[PDB]
Fold Ryanodine receptor 1.
Amino acid sequence: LTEDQGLVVVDACKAHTKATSFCFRVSKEKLKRDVEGMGPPEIKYGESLCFVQHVASGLWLTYAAVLKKKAILHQEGHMDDALFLTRCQQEESQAARMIHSTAGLYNQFIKGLDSFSGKPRLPI
């Protein structure tokens, strides 16, 4: 929840905890911690509906209105936003962080190609 914007993906260090302390709730009731402990199985994958909340603000997530609709945190929103969790296979999730560090590496390396491009005198 950016101060400027209130719901965007954003740089990891740039997103301080207060700016993004999201959590689910079983229902829209605004109304402890740490079993040590895998903990009680409160939330099913599949058919364990939970609604997004910015706990620091208490907003309930909702789409505004190609179907690439914007989603926005909001004080109320539609009742219909019955989000529910679903795990990826570990045949793919690895292929994602793999997307990531690799993408970071090649990006900064292209910055390194930019470092001497027109200017003659690098994670090689």
